[PDB]
Amino acid sequence: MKILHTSDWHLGVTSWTSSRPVDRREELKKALDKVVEEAEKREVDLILLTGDLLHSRNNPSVVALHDLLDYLKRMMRTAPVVVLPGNQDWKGLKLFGNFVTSISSDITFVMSFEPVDVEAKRGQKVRILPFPYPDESKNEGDFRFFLESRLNKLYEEALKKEDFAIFMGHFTVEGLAGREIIINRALIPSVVDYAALGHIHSFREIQKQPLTIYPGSLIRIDFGEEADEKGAVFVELKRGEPPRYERIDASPLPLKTLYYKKIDTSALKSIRDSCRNFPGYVRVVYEEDSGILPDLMGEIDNLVKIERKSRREIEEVLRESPEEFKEELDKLDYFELFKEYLKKREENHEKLLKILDELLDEVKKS
Amino acid sequence: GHMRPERLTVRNFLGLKNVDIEFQSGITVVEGPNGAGKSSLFEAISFALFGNGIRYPNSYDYVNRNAVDGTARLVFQFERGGKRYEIIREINALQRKHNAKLSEILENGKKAAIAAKPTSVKQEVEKILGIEHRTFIRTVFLPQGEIDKLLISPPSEITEIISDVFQSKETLEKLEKLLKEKMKKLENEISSSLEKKLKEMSDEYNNLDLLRKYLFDKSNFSRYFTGRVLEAVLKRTKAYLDILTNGRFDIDFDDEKGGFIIKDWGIERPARGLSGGERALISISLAMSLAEVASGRLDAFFIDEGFSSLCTENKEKIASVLKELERLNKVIVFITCDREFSEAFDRKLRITGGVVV
Numbered sequence A: 001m002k003i004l005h006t007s008d009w010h011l012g013v014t015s016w017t018s019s020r021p022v023d024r025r026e027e028l029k030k031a032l033d034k035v036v037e038e039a040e041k042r043e044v045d046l047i048l049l050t051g052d053l054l055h056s057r058n059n060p061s062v063v064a065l066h067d068l069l070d071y072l073k074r075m076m077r078t079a080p081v082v083v084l085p086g087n088q089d090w091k092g093l094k095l096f097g098n099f100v101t102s103i104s105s106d107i108t109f110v111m112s113f114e115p116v117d118v119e120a121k122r123g124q125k126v127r128i129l130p131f132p133y134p135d136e137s138k139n140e141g142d143f144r145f146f147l148e149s150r151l152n153k154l155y156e157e158a159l160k161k162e163d164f165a166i167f168m169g170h171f172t173v174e175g176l177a178g179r180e181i182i183i184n185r186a187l188i189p190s191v192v193d194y195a196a197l198g199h200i201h202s203f204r205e206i207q208k209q210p211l212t213i214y215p216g217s218l219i220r221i222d223f224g225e226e227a228d229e230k231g232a233v234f235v236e237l238k239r240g241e242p243p244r245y246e247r248i249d250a251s252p253l254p255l256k257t258l259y260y261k262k263i264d265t266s267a268l269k270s271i272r273d274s275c276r277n278f279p280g281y282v283r284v285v286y287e288e289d290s291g292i293l294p295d296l297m298g299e300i301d302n303l304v305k306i307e308r309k310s311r312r313e314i315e316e317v318l319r320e321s322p323e324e325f326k327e328e329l330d331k332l333d334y335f336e337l338f339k340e341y342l343k344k345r346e347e348n349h350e351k352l353l354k355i356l357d358e359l360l361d362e363v364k365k366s
Numbered sequence B: 001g002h003m004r005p006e007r008l009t010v011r012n013f014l015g016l017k018n019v020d021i022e023f024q025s026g027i028t029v030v031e032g033p034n035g036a037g038k039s040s041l042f043e044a045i046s047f048a049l050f051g052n053g054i055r056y057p058n059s060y061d062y063v064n065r066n067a068v069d070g071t072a073r074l075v076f077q078f079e080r081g082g083k084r085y086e087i088i089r090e091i092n093a094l095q096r097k098h099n100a101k102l103s104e105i106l107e108n109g110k111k112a113a114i115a116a117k118p119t120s121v122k123q124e125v126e127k128i129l130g131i132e133h134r135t136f137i138r139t140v141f142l143p144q145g146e147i148d149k150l151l152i153s154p155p156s157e158i159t160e161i162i163s164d165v166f167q168s169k170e171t172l173e174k175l176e177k178l179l180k181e182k183m184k185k186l187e188n189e190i191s192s193s194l195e196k197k198l199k200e201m202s203d204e205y206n207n208l209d210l211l212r213k214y215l216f217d218k219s220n221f222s223r224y225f226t227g228r229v230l231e232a233v234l235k236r237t238k239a240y241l242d243i244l245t246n247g248r249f250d251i252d253f254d255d256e257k258g259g260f261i262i263k264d265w266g267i268e269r270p271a272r273g274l275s276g277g278e279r280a281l282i283s284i285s286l287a288m289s290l291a292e293v294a295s296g297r298l299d300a301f302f303i304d305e306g307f308s309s310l311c312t313e314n315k316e317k318i319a320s321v322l323k324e325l326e327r328l329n330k331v332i333v334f335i336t337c338d339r340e341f342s343e344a345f346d347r348k349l350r351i352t353g354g355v356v357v
Ligand SMILES: Nc1ncnc2c1ncn2[C@@H]1O[C@H](COP(=O)(O)OP(=O)(O)O)[C@@H](O)[C@H]1O
Pocket: B013, B014, B015, B016, B032, B033, B034, B035, B036, B037, B038, B039, B040, B041, B061, B062, B063, B064, B065, B066
């Protein structure tokens, strides 16, 4: 069976809104168009979309929705599509999804853990085992507990398959790089023929058995995604054989970050030469500036973002864990702070503390 | 600590008719239409504790003029040191009587008076709480329209309430006078193998003179202390600003430069010069930071309609940052009638027409 798997479109997004707005639509529609055309070429049997097709959970553009529905329509013409909504997809999409799956057999939405059986273009029997994004909402415990039970059930249901079983998930697996439920890859039932994931923007082969893939986004959404790969994935599945796959490159506009410590006439030179004929977008992060950059950014169109290197000494305290937190605050007591003040400036006498200690032990009885 | 509000009950106070609500830990957002009585709620607490609110000068102005029975009744239940306290006030418009009553709750249906009369109740409440009304509204009870009060306060007031929040100034006051008494008895005993008993009695005395010194020259350890705490606070604030503004905005404290100093891209900018949105974002980070560093001391954090001037993209950014407060079993309440800011949180107390709906 021939499959197109694509995800994390984010239709409707504009980047660097605060800073220098870039509406990504044009780029994105080019990527989508190239992926769709490729699907027609290969004449795939099945189309799997694994979530975050829209950018906004709450206020979705009418242009975005228009675009999304048009793409769904184009895709349906070539092969049945199966859609698993993500955490960022508009809340109402599921409703329309539900409505429309009871109306065509060329599109089906899955919004629970409930398996559904579908038929591909050449009549291949496909069981979809869905694992939607896990609401944030010991209690974690019971939730992971509940989530294991659901994965157990998908396994049961994978065993009853006819031709193919496919897992569709939208979540983060263990091993990358906040308040998400991270899910170990080992928990993805091996008896499935394919495990299609979404939610992560870099293409990533998660494991070979079962074959587990994030196809990644179709555009570079922000500067963390300077190096990674963007596209969809073509997958072929055959009963007897192991699965085969092939990335379909999206060829998106490049991103680039320039690093300088001092913005001098020299940095001023590189920056201009760097942005000069760049089809993409550029960020500079810096340490010391004389007000050049805000002025510069104004006049270089594809320079979309400037940013102070955040101090390490400042990075930490927000990572810093409840272990470190309690120590820190308890080191802030008026007296245990008074410790080092003494140990600094009269150093030698610490009976003074033993003096202090009973002294405070005394009053706390009054 | 561990100051911690428990129950609030309100009848005929400002725009509130009848409300009885219990404070959970974590985040509640309080919502409803304009004039529904959201702010009235926040003021009821202020009034319960201190016998005044933000909005009127006279007690009896606070009586709900739209109730035929013109008596406001506030019942406020909090906690501090494993102990429960409850405060009861009544204001009567016709009589122009203000009644107030403070008592401890105990082993069961049990009540131990501490004050009647509103002067004594205020007195005893400050005592219990440790903090003044002024430091309360500038730190964790941020009243509508006044989000930036701390931010633009004189350095004097800034340190004067860092001390108040962090000191245990009564443990301190007993100490200072336990020392005088310890030293005087010793001096007395000196003014009267004998050199050996005298050695010890004088050895003991000169420590005490030292401990006294590094403790009540004020302009020494006290300043040192407030500086180190402000450091811990601004450390966190700078971090939040770096997230929220890509390192564009920075904040510092300098008693000689007039207090909190804000810089935009390295350049000094008076708070009055900021955009409304920027002022809010900075006040919130500062306040949020204060509340973190003050965990243990204070267990509550209220923001009264402080999100209006935020634009859509700052609203999300800021909601995201405030959830990092959910970690501290603080009772946290945000009053807002804004959809885009409230969508972010799960638990809602809705008020319309002066009641919960
Ligand atoms: N003394 C009073 N008696 C009765 N109502 C009052 C009194 N003072 C103000 N109000 C009204 O009470 C209502 C509640 O105000 P408020 O709590 O500030 O609204 P919001 O829900 O927007 O925060 C308003 O309609 C206000 O005008």
